[PDB]
């Protein structure tokens, strides 16, 4: 009641001061349910113990009338009523010990302790961004060692939102030539020369920049001259501005440039030092890059004006305005701009987005069939060398069209009470006419230390999933630039589009069904509906069969409609490392995330950076946020946050595994350390017709499991270092222990239950047989000959045995654990020897002088500690000899001096 609430408040205050309804935010983990099952097992063991006590406490009807009646003479009577009364209240007052008292709070005590130790990791501290790992939910952290699936949004996580201009498609002509790391990776994976050829390409690009700047200086003088800020290198388009490729080329190229400069949602602000200098910052990095490169090439957009744009061309100023704007929507995947220009007055509706959303709607009857093919090929190769596709489509509105647009706007503006649905439907139905005029090319840079980190995670035996919506070719190229997507694997692409429509063009459901049946029958063997799913859920995942699988938007959309489709998709997604999905909304991928979570449940990571990732984190086992784009708001609706992705390598692989092992080992230790205390009482109560003999002190109800020996178990739970961080990083194979769940099972529960029973047997029957013959061992005076003093013997044996046992299993003998072990024993001795010298020990009163001074005490604790530690230590040795696990093997080999040249806390980004 009050004590629990006040201690919760005080520990929250301690958490707050050390950091600078209910508890669980949303849902618990599997460990909580397994703990509930284990506590139910403890409860039923207590209940059967009570039953086997109470049968004897009452079966004495046919037993001999011992001296239990020759002294009392108080025959109450009522065997059916009063004896049952005695039994029930004896049961309810003397069998309340096996139930865990502090475990229900100690679990989250340990969780918050290790979480705050996570929070204080200076190696998990960002330098540039300066955002360490800040936990939000202190409850769920044990799952971080059993992770076997990662869900990643490559918009901000895999690559930073630092845009770079490479090429641009104008009227089917590609302008822009350079050499990025992606091009070098493609060339080196194509088998062609890359060192001499790479240097030749670099010097050619340098010559192109030299001639571009020379021509720019010679022909005119621009307002954006700069020795280091210049990033424009394309020589083809700098000369193709006036008349290089004809007058029509000029008309189309400036028309495209004006259309693009009329299509953006970018905020432009002047620099504080120099107002003319551009400090363009906004929410859309791609549009910011587009306007920056427009400024560099000559279309300088300087100033902060929302009711119109002010742009200068080599000094010639011009002002305009965009009439209507429709920003990017999570479902639209595009931005719409409606402009109107007076004279021949004309309106222009321009839709900016990816290929899938733009090619979906257009004038089928009226198609150029020339610009369409050119743009399609342009974007195909752009995705091939990894250029993010940004295409724009134009729609002209004449005077009659403008008038009917105005009429439709003024007649559809009277809609209220969620008009958005009506507006979306009417715009979709009447917006069937579109014409494409081209697009641009932008590329993204990766994070720091991506390939090595993802490779060592892959070598750790864990599988990751990566998501996007743009397209597949850019996605696979980004994967190839890093080393997550190696060679020697073919693509299990299930696209319901492309060249496959030429020969087998039909509705997508049956074609994707045929191809997935092909994959499920003759590519991998899992043809079925029930047996294979159960086999997969029983096997609990394993990285094998290193291939790659690709899905398209339509197949994923229709996959949610079929039970057989979802089970077959779950079966086929058992690839080793590579899983890719595109053309899907965040709702659809959230649905597939919860699908893969429900069946064959496995802890899933939800790393993401954006706005579409919130659906990932809200429906996930555990999520980690990234402080990148405007979607950084996702971190509040998340579990953990970190400045950059490269840090999570240390989090899940190193610290999460330690969490999992420490918890899964210490919980069984806590269950072990409690059963003996009640079981000794059970054996002492066998006599007196099970009247309920209370062997221990009235004060031992609490201090045994609350003050004396509760320290080292939680100490090992929180302050354990299973292995050095460096060697774990170099050799992450030990993480398979979380993959195969080789430390959490009911067999361990029963094994430690039997171990506790046997330990209690030794602990009870050593001092008892030390007194069987004459119990006159005093060496002076009378002796002890009382239940409380033999209780002192047995509790001392039990506590020293448990403390040495958890000390034994403790993997890091340091200057910290042994000190508090010695302190726990010292305070036990001191309390037992001091509190006995008080009136509160009215009966006992003499522990120190009548027990400790006796050499029998030491003579019996010696045999107690040997018969406790030696059998299980020999079992440990024989298990480490005939079944040597990898952890002790790597421990001893690195201790021997093999891995000492490397320092501690080394990083690959140095």
């Amino acid at each position: 009641s009050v004590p629990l609430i006040v201690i919760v408040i005080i520990t929250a205050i301690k958490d707050g001061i050390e950091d600078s309804a209910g508890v669980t935010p949303t849902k618990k983990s599997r460990i909580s349910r397994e703990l509930n099952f284990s506590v139910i097992l403890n409860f039923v063991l207590l209940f059967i113990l009570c039953f086997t006590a109470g049968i004897v406490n009452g079966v004495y009807y046919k037993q001999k009338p011992r001296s239990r009646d020759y002294f009392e003479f108080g025959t109450i009577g009522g065997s059916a009523s009063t004896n049952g009364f005695v039994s029930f209240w004896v049961a309810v007052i003397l069998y309340q010990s096996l139930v865990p008292i502090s475990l229900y709070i100690s679990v989250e005590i340990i969780k918050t302790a290790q979480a705050i130790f996570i929070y204080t990791d200076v190696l998990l501290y960002n330098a540039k961004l300066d955002y360490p790992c800040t936990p939000k939910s202190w409850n769920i952290s044990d799952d971080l060692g059993q992770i076997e699936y990662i869900f990643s949004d490559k918009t901000g996580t895999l690559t930073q939102n630092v845009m770079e201009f490479k090429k641009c498609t104008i009227n089917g002509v590609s302008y822009g030539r350079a050499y990025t790391e992606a091009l070098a990776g493609l060339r080196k994976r194509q088998g062609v020369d890359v060192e001499s050829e790479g240097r030749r390409e670099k010097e050619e690009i340098a010559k192109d920049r030299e001639t571009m700047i020379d021509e720019l200086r010679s022909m005119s003088d621009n307002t954006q001259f700069c020795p280091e800020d210049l990033t424009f290198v394309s020589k083809e388009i700098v000369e193709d501005l006036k008349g290089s490729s004809g007058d029509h080329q000029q008309k189309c190229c400036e028309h495209f440039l004006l259309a693009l400069a009329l299509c953006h949602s970018v905020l432009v602000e002047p620099n504080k030092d120099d107002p003319k200098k551009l400090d363009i910052k906004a929410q859309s990095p791609d549009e910011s890059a587009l306007v920056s490169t427009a400024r560099q090439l000559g279309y300088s957009f300087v100033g902060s004006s929302k009711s119109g744009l002010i742009v200068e061309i080599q000094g010639v100023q011009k002002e305009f305005q965009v009439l209507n704007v429709l920003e990017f929507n999570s479902s639209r995947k595009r931005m719409s701009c409606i402009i109107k220009i007076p004279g021949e007055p004309k309106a222009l509706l321009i839709c900016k987005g990816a290929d899938s959303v733009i090619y979906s709607r257009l004038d089928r009857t009226q198609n150029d069939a020339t610009l369409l093919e050119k743009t399609a090929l342009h974007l195909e190769e752009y995705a091939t060398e990894g250029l993010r596709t940004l295409c724009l489509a134009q729609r002209e509105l004449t005077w009659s069209e403008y008038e009917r647009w105005v009429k439709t706007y003024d007649v559809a503006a009277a809609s209220v009470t969620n008009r958005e649905e009506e507006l979306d439907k009417v715009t979709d139905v009447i917006e069937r006419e579109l014409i494409l005029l081209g697009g641009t090319a932008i590329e993204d840079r990766l994070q720091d230390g991506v390939p090595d980190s993802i490779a060592l995670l892959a070598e750790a035996g864990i599988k990751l999933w990566v998501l996007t919506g743009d397209k597949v070719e850019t996605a696979i190229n980004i994967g190839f630039s890093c080393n997550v997507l190696n060679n020697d694997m073919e693509l299990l692409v299930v696209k319901a589009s492309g060249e496959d429509v030429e020969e087998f063009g039909s509705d997508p459901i049956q074609v994707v069904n045929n191809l997935v049946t092909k994959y499920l029958r003759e590519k991998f063997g899992m043809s079925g509906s029930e047996e294979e799913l159960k086999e997969a859920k029983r096997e609990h995942g394993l990285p094998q069969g290193n291939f790659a699988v690709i899905i398209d938007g339509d197949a994923l959309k229709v996959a949610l409609n079929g039970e057989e489709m979802r089970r077959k998709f779950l079966l086929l997604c058992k690839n080793c490392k590579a899983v890719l999905c595109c053309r899907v909304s965040p709702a659809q991928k959230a649905a597939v995330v919860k699908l893969v979570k429900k069946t064959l449940d496995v802890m899933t990571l939800a790393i993401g950076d954006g706005s579409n990732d919130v659906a990932m984190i809200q429906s996930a086992d555990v999520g980690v946020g990234i402080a990148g784009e405007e979607g950084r708001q996702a971190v509040m609706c998340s579990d953990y946050a970190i400045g950059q992705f490269r840090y999570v390598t240390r989090l899940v692989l190193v610290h999460g595994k330690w969490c999992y092992k420490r918890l899964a080992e210490m919980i069984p230790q806590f269950f072990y350390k409690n059963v003996i205390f009640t079981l000794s009482l059970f054996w002492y109560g066998i006599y007196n017709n099970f009247d309920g003999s209370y062997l221990f002190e009235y004060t031992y109800l609490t201090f045994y499991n609350l003050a004396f020996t509760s320290v080292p178990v939680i100490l090992l739970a929180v302050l354990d270092q299973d292995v050095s961080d460096t060697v774990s990083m170099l050799v992450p194979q030990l993480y398979r222990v979380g993959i195969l769940r080789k430390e959490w099972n009911q067999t361990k529960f029963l094994w430690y239950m039997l171990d506790g029973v046997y330990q209690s047997v030794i602990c009870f029957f050593f001092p008892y047989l030390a007194y069987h013959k004459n119990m006159v061992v005093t060496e002076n005076g009378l002796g002890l000959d009382h239940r409380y003093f033999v209780g002192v013997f047995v509790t001392a044996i039990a506590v020293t045995s448990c403390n040495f046992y958890v000390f034994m299993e403790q993997y890091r003998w340091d200057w910290f654990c042994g000190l508090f072990i010695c302190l726990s024993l010292a305070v036990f001795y001191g309390w037992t020897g001091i509190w006995t010298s008080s009136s509160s020990s009215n009966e006992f009163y003499k522990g120190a002088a009548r027990v400790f001074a006796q050499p029998a005490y030491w003579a019996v604790l010696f045999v107690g500690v040997l018969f406790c530690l030696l059998p299980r230590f020999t079992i440990d040795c024989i298990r480490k000899i005939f079944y040597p696990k990898d952890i002790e093997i790597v421990r001893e080999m690195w201790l021997r001096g093999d891995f000492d040249l490397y320092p501690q806390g080394y990083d690959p980004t140095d």
């Binding site: 009338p65 001296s67 239990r68 020759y70 002294f71 009392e72 108080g74 130790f117 204080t120 200076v122 190696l123 035996g461 006599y687 007196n688 009247d691 003999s693 209370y694 302050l719 270092q721 194979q733 398979r736 008892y768 047989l769 030390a770 007194y771 013959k773 004459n774 119990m775 006159v776 061992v777 005093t778 060496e779 005076g781 009378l782 002796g783 000959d785 009382h786 239940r787 409380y788 003093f789 890091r812 003998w813 340091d814 200057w815 009966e843 009163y845 003579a859 019996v860 010696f862 040997l866 018969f867 030696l870 040795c877 480490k880 000899i881 093997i889 001893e892 201790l895 093999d898 806390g905």
Partner: protein, 365 residues
């Protein structure tokens, strides 16, 4: 201002030592612990193999035979000495009756005669042993008062309707006067008298001196407090009517200052077997010879076949004759040595290099 502090502790890099299980480290620790522990086990066994002991059961020395000197049945006397194996020397028992007591159920004096073949090392304890005495009944063991510690005399309500500990079963009588030694634990006291001296048939001019001063330490001396008995509300226990037919008067009050054995029975035995010290001799070296004791028979025990006897011993650094400690020491030494040799053989038989990278669970491919 906001940068986290860098330290070994905040990163959990405190200095540590990680021992591993290798024969170069496993063997020496086993050999040293085994040799020292077997050595001390042999030492304690040698110490235990020296002390003597005699015990005689006399719970049924009132109808086993007549009032003559008859031999005690072998199921009652057990003798252990460090220089004799077949030292039978069957003790004799005799009974003498007295009609001065109305309680004819159990009365009279039981005299016993035993002998010792060797002298003693100036350290003699005499205890009374009880067998099958149920002192672990909750109502029995949770029936005593707290005021008797200080000699205070509270009201009947404070001792009858008190908390879980009180003199509930025998709180009140027909008179209503409370009991100073209330509670069944005190009311069920052993009721026998022991001689303060031991007769010596060899040389009667110097008998063997005994005392009942010093059974327990000064705890009771540090427990004694001034008392204020009202000498009018105190009534004898219902089982003490024969002891006090007239009840307590202003002279027969049970004092605690000197003869604490009246209350040394406060705490019961650990378990069914019951044994408490009744006679101590530190000054007089007991020589060999024949000796005789006399014991009253006031306490009834045959109503449920309970057993009662005497036990004379010497003690040691580890008490009296009980080879159980030596047994456990030898068992532990043998088990530890056997494990050490088993693993030594497995190292010889399974001779292989300790750190094998190919043995990892991921080196199959």
């Amino acid at each position: 201002n906001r940068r986290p502090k860098e330290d070994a502790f905040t990163q959990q890099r405190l200095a540590a030592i990680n021992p591993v299980l290798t024969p170069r480290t496993v063997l020496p620790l086993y050999l040293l612990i085994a040799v020292v522990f077997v050595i001390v086990g042999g030492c304690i066994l040698a110490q235990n193999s020296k002390v003597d002991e005699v015990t005689i059961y006399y719970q049924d020395c009132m109808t086993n035979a007549t009032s003559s000197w008859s031999d005690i049945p072998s199921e009652h006397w057990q003798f252990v000495f460090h220089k004799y194996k077949t030292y039978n020397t069957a003790p004799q028992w005799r009974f003498v009756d007295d009609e001065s007591d109305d309680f004819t159920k159990q009365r009279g004096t039981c005299q016993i005669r035993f002998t010792t073949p060797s002298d003693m090392k100036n350290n003699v304890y005499l205890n009374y042993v009880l067998e099958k005495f149920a002192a672990n009944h909750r109502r029995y063991v949770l029936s005593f008062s707290e005021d008797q510690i200080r000699g205070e005399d509270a009201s009947y309500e404070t001792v009858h309707d008190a908390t879980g500990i009180n003199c509930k079963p025998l709180s009140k009588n027909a008179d209503g006067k409370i009991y100073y030694p209330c509670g069944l634990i005190a009311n069920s006291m052993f009721n026998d008298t022991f001689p303060l001296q031991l007769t010596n048939v060899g040389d009667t001019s110097n008998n063997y001196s005994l005392t009942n001063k010093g059974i327990n330490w000064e705890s009771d001396k540090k427990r004694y407090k001034k008392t204020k008995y009202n000498y009018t509300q105190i009534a004898p226990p219902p089982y003490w009517e024969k002891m006090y037919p007239d009840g307590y008067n202003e002279t027969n009050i049970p004092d605690i200052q000197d003869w604490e054995e009246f209350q040394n029975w406060m705490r019961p035995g650990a378990f069914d077997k019951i044994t408490k010290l009744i006679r101590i001799n530190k000054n007089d070296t007991l020589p060999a010879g024949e000796y005789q004791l006399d014991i009253g028979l006031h306490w009834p025990v045959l109503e449920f076949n309970g057993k009662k006897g005497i036990y004379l011993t010497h003690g040691s650094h580890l008490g009296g004759r009980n080879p159980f400690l030596g047994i456990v020491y030898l068992i532990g030494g043998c088990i530890c040595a056997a494990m050490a040799l088993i693993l030594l053989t497995f190292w010889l038989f399974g001779g292989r290099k300790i750190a094998d990278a190919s043995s990892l669970s991921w080196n199959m491919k």
